[PDB]
């Protein structure tokens, strides 16, 4: 499968391209084999579904043979294999959604510890690299622990997630009070 990474709360676009530069019948399904959308619109009209009202395509691109699946307001649980079927061909895309948080809602004090946690789909083992406002780089798995924060650590941290050779970047504001 092609792997695509998404950020929690963000939008992701899963591309699908046909051999011919023209519109033709297509649909997207998930790994449970539920059809999501196709040429005639969203199939999710039979009751409550996880993706209800959050999945779309770009109808204006279909006549170029491009049939993307766009999912907005991403949840970790949207992580799934999505399958685009156009005529006789099927393309499988594994979407993996991640979210980044710190273990504080308001603020930290100089000398306190920081835990950065990548909320991750079940069974994933991403690697994470973060850069502090001072320019120092740290790396590890889904959870990074910083022993003590300095006043100079107050500001925007930048963290890159690596999973299946794909990367996605998060920014998070950490405030350290004196």
């Amino acid at each position, epitope marked *: 499968k092609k792997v695509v990474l998404g950020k929690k709360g963000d939008t992701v676009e899963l591309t699908c391209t046909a051999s011919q530069k023209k519109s033709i019948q297509f649909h997207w399904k998930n790994s449970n084999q539920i059809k999501i959308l196709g040429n005639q619109g969203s199939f999710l009209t039979k009751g409550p579904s996880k993706l209800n009202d959050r999945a779309d395509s770009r109808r204006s691109l279909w006549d170029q043979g491009n049939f993307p699946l766009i999912i907005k307001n991403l949840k*970790i*649980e*949207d*992580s*799934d294999t999505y399958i685009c079927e156009v005529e006789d061909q099927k393309e499988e895309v594994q979407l993996l*959604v991640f979210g980044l948080t710190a273990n504080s809602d308001t603020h930290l004090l100089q000398g306190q510890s920081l835990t950065l946690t990548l909320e991750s*789909p*079940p*069974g994933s*083992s991403p690697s994470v690299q973060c850069r502090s406002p001072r320019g120092k780089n740290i790396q590890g798995g889904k959870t990074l622990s910083v022993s003590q924060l300095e006043l100079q650590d107050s500001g925007t941290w930048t963290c890159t997630v690596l999973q299946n050779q794909k990367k996605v970047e998060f920014k998070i504001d950490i405030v350290v009070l004196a």
Partner: nanobody
Amino acid sequence: EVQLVESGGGLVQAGGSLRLSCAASISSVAMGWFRQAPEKEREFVAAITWSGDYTNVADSMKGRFTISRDNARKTVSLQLTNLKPEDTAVYYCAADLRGGSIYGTADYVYWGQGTQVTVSS
């Protein structure tokens, strides 16, 4: 209501292979395997969709562990290979994600009592 009964645990040798089974008493729901060692968190091991067409084995266990199911027999199975002392744990069968993605959620409704696997060094 669904009953899940594991079998196949026991005392095994490092480097060996072991197949665990779980008998259910359905063909419409996702099923999964988990494991828990003493004084450690329960860990996701593997999941499989209702049809068996897609599986999700934990990244750290891919290419050692595989998962399969048999809807006619109402079973799901976990194949362990190249066993390590670190694999010692109770292994739990689970079922029903309420339609959720086996790649997106591990919040299964039904749980077995588990089968103990102990890997001798």
